[PDB]
Amino acid sequence: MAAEAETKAMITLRSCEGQVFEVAEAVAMESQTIRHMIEDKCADTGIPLPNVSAKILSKVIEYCSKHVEARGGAAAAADGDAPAPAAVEANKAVEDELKTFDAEFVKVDQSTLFDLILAANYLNIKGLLDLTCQTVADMIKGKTPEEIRKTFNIKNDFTPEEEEEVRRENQWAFE
Amino acid sequence: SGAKLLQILNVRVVGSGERVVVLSHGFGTDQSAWSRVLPYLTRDHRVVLYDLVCAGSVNPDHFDFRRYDNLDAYVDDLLAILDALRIPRCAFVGHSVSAMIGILASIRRPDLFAKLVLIGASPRFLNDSDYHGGFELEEIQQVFDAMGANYSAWATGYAPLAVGADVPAAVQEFSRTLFNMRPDISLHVCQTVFKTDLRGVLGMVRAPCVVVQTTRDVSVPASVAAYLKAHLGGRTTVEFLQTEGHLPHLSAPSLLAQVLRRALARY
Amino acid sequence: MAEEEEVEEGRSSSSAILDLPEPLLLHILSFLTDVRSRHRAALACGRMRAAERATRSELSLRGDPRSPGFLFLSHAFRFPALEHLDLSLVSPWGHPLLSSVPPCGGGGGGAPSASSSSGMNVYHPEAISEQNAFIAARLAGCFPAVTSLAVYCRDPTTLANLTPHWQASLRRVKLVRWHQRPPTLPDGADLEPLLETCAALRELDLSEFYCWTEDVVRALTTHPSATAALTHLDLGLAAATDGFKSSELGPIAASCPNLRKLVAPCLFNPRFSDCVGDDALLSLATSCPRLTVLRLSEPFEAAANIQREEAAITVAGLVAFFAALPALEDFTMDLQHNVLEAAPAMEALARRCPRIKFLTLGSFQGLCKASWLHLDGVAVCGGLESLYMKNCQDLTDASLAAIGRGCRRLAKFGIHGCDLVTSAGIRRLAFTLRPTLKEVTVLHCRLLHTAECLTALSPIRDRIESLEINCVWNTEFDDLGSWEMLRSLSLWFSAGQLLSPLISAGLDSCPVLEEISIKVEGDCRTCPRPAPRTIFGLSDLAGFPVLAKMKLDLSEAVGYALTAPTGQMDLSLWERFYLHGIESLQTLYELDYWPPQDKDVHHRSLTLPAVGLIQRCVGLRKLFIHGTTHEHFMTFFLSIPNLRDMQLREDYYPAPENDLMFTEMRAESWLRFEVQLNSRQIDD
């Protein structure tokens, strides 16, 4: 008997402009919006993504496949027993690898990172969302509202009498 | 005015009794130096405590150097306080320069100071011809130099000398109050006090006087108590405590409280 | 001609984070915890200001709420989503808030001689209740969703004023009082308003709220309706009590069938008949079968020299108590008396409480012996992750190995008063629990000196994150790895001991060390005067790069605060000695200091040398002093560019009474100096 190769179910993805991506369903499993439609059995012909372009879709696919791979490679606990000290070390490395994968993953331009933020919400990929959502929080961390304004190319909209008043009202912020 | 001076000089009304007693603290101290002995008279007397203008508790901005170069302005503050308290008659217990203040006040207002109790009293500190104030001009100027060059070092070298008896709690309290003093104000008022000579006015003091003298006083020779009992015009008596030092209100509260309650029974 | 077709690149790119749907921004900033960055971003833009206002859950108001500046805040100062409200730090510190009791202004015992016409303050209760209601209404408007509330309660009138606005939602309450309990209050009256108003209460806290146990019994056992519904309780009472008695605890247990968490110091001294014996233990166990967190302690005084006496608790009682409460997961039982042979008790605990995770025992002897082919006592409780021990005089290295083989899930380890433990057993336990051990605590172990203990911790030195140690200095250069995960350190020092040897002992490179606490214990008066150039060695800690938070507790350091007899050293010089080199901490961001206490002075007063020492730490952002000081020292700190959060917390029982009689800090001076500090233009 020939060995039946386990066929990872492919879910067809059709981006906003018409480009198609072939991914495993387990990759498509992560995105809750994609997940939900999978069980709706409307994914036989492929699902439209009118709000996701090819580049953001490819990077989302990259992120989701990487995190699914990390989940699979994590040493699963043996039915209620705490993992052996070797197993703990193996899983700690995968997290560190996945976290390291995450940091440079959001090391993109603001627009792409902003685009990374939107897609994970539309795709309901919380892990990608949170990684991108907190990424902005760190790059705001340690900054005054002014260079924040330049960093996002925000024009300072406060009149001097307003900005003076608000700065003193919020004096317990910086200190 | 007296009323604002009450707030400025921390004038507070406690105790009960028809007998009104005025407590004034000494050098480098404040009215809380009487706390260890405050309860003993609160039962029998309506007690009045106030802070001198030189105390660090009062705003050092309020210290008028030029008016407070003489004990006269301090007597003025005391009298304005007492008039603000509508006191027509009271006894006075003074410590150190407060004794001179009370001497001058009873001279000025004999109608108010029924009886006087003196703890560590000295009308003059500089030794004179036939007068041992216990200090010479060189010693006083050396003290000035030690304090001006280093108020911290002088105060550390002075506070155990002032307290005398080996009571670290009293020495600590005096060190606290002395260090809360302001150096320029302190030099000014010490110059005010050492220069004060009330030997010519003790006989004008009409009120009966109670002198409290310790076994050993670094600044008060026992001959000073003899001079005080000799020259004060009022019927003057000297009570001797079986303890050494200048601030028995902090070191031996029991003995001094005994003496005071004996004295304040009637006046 | 035209020759003009090359200017079409000027479109302002918008910050797409603003283009995000608003709930997404709310979600993002739901993750932001640090209030500094929160309000920085809020100041970046108005839309972000609204987002940060809506994303706040907990808050501690700083300044005087009674001040009209807080009272007249605009509608923008609005926090609908604020859950946890902390009002215990409002200005002034230590004061009754919205208290209906009139101030005791010149009320000495004595009939007022009614011949005096000058400036008598006529009390107006109507106005007082008016401002109390208005401030409560303003607080409710700013903070409508408060369910867990912390407040300083000098008197229950504060509680009566505050409860109606949040009684429907308030489920946890924290009461604060370091000042003396008002003697005129009826027994249990401090707690009655809450037992009467807040039906939603589910957790109660009184660990630091000074009061009598009898008040607790009265208020609780006479309010069974509320007590049947509570879920969490703490009874520390500022640890100013000798401990609850059995007769007090009993009816409490009766009125409360539904508790889950308890913390309570209790009278465990067997010489008292009303001590907590096994009978009280099982009565509590039966009364509250659903309990999950229990932290029980025997209050003691330092004069109790080596408590060799036994406790009123037997191993059989322990076993039965374990059986009666299957739902336990956190347990703390600290005694000064010794419980012998409690290993079978520990076995019954493991069997009857398989969910046991946190264990804390004091003076329990013979818990783990490894004296049989099988693991014994605590060595069987393999599901344990937390383990702290006090006064285990007979714990051995073989016991350590048995525990490590059994408690392979142990993450935090601690021993106190374990004289028989050597560096060999410590190193064995560290190696065995190396993947899991992350925290280790060693205090006052006689054989375990600093260098030996640091050497024995090499296997987990790369993994260890927090460390607590009492420093005992004795009278190839292998590369000892940097403390790569060690972010926190706790230090215990004898009076006069030097911090400098710590760096040499093995603690030199801690790149991730963020916070540290140093405790100095001992009578400095009996200690010989060190040389005038001797310092503690605070500058020696500058080698830690992310060192930001400091907690130097010297309140236990008792000395002649202001003058020592000839040959001894005053607390002014002691402050100079200990605080010297603090300015070396470049990243020093937070400092928590305890002024040393003199027995003769109710106050832990700060001296000027300490003022000068601290004033030069420009990087200090936060400064919390646990005492009092002179008003003339205050203006120095305005020179520090960056400090705001400064409050003299006399948070030690008894909190001294501040009534116009002390040269130390005054309330009006405090308010005007807060105006001074918030008047400085600050960095952003």
Residue numbers in the entry:
A (entry chain B): 1 to 175
B (entry chain C): 52 to 318
C (entry chain A): 1 to 475, 512 to 720
Pull verbatim passages from the article behind this deposition.
Strigolactones (SLs) play fundamental roles in regulating plant architecture, which is a major factor determining crop yield. When the SL level is low, D53 interacts with the transcriptional repressor TOPLESS through its EAR motif and inhibits downstream gene expression. D53 belongs to the AAA+ ATPase family and comprises four distinct domains: the N-terminal region, the D1 ATPase domain, the bridge M domain and the D2 ATPase domain.
Here, we found that apo-D53 was rather flexible and reconstituted the holo-complex containing D53, S-phase kinase-associated protein 1 (SKP1), D3 and D14 with rac-GR24. After 3D classification, a subset of 42,499 particles remained and was used for reconstruction, yielding a final cryo-EM map with a resolution of 7.09Å estimated by the gold Fourier shell correlation standard. Unfortunately, front, tilted and side views of the cryo-EM map did not reveal the location of D53. Unfortunately, D53 was too flexible to capture in a certain form, and the electron density information was lost during average and classification processing. No large conformational rearrangement was observed between the structures of the two complexes. Compared with the ASK1−D3−AtD14 complex, D14 in the SKP1−D3−D14 complex was flipped away from D3 at ∼9Å. Although the density does not have enough details to allow for accurate fitting of the SKP1−D3−D14 structure and the approximate 9Å rotation may relate to the difference in D14 proteins from rice and Arabidopsis, the local conformational differences are still possibly associated with the formation of holo-complex.
